[PDB]
């Protein structure tokens, strides 16, 4: 399941299990496995020949893939990514609504549009204009006639 969390294909997990077949639990080291193994071995169709290295890795890989994707569904873990965030809406929701109902320029009265033009024209065309007259003015005033 950890390998599936690391985005591995079905072949990668199988070869990972092939090299890690010795990490399966030991019945002596765990009290829980004592009764589970006894209950597991009591089934009618359980043959010890079915515990082949290939048969073990196939069933573990199939179940692990199902188990991994199952908990991705029940626990989407998509929280803490986009939580309830109120970016600016709770105070700026009136602005975004006002944006979609903003009056276009061609619907304004002519006199109102002209006043807006004068403010825009002076800031972008008159203020931005460069006229250097200080040097010329001082030179003219410094001459005796």
């Amino acid at each position: 399941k950890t390998r599936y969390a690391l985005k591995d294909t079905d072949e990668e997990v199988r070869e990972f299990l092939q090299n890690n077949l010795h990490l399966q639990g030991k019945v002596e080291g765990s009290p829980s496995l004592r009764w589970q193994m006894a209950l597991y071995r009591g089934l009618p169709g359980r043959e010890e020949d079915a515990d082949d290295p290939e048969k073990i890795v196939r069933r573990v890989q199939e179940v692990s893939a199902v188990l991994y994707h199952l908990e991705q569904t029940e626990h989407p873990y998509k929280s803490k990514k986009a939580v309830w965030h109120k970016l600016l809406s709770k105070q700026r929701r009136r602005a975004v609504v006002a944006c979609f109902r903003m009056t276009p320029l061609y619907n304004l009265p002519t006199h109102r549009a002209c006043n807006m033009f004068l403010e825009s024209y002076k800031a972008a065309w008159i203020l931005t204009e460069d006229h250097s007259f200080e040097d010329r003015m001082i030179d003219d005033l410094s001459k005796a006639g």
Binding site: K78, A82, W84, L87, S89, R93, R94, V96, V97, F100
Partner: protein, 149 residues
């Protein structure tokens, strides 16, 4: 403010209405002037209530209604019409088509117009949060109780 509540056209219309009440043109509304227009509309009130409906809007207490007080009355009337319906317009901004549900494409349309951009996948993240029913659309009832999409 009056500029926020009223437009230039509305101010002109209110001035004409004020001049309709003020036949004299002195700039003030008296009880007889107010009473005269009420009789033209059918009502026949007494001076007791006629004074009361003047004092209810008369600010300086001079006993007469001038245009600044008349505009202030109309400004309140325009403002208090909407109390909590501001969420209705907010819902319609997300609801382009005009039905009672917010679709993911409609949520894309408003998000496209806004500054922030979505990668066509996280749009499903917040719509499923807002949509409790799981039908893929956020209705008006789901929007007011909790707003995320």
């Amino acid at each position: 403010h009056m500029a926020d509540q009223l437009t230039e056209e509305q101010i002109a219309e209110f001035k004409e209405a004020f001049s309709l009440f003020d036949k004299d043109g002195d700039g003030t509304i008296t009880t007889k002037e107010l009473g005269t227009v009420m009789r033209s509309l059918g009502q026949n009130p007494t001076e007791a209530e006629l004074q009361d409906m003047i004092n209810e809007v008369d600010a300086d207490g001079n006993g007469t209604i001038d245009f600044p007080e008349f505009l202030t009355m109309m400004a309140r009337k325009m403002k208090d019409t909407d109390s909590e319906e501001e969420i209705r317009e907010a819902f319609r901004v997300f609801d382009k088509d005009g039905n009672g549900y917010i679709s993911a494409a409609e949520l894309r349309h408003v998000m496209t117009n806004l500054g922030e951009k979505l990668t066509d996948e996280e749009v499903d993240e917040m719509i499923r949060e807002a949509d409790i029913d799981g039908d893929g659309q956020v209705n008006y009832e789901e929007f007011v109780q909790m707003m995320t999409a």
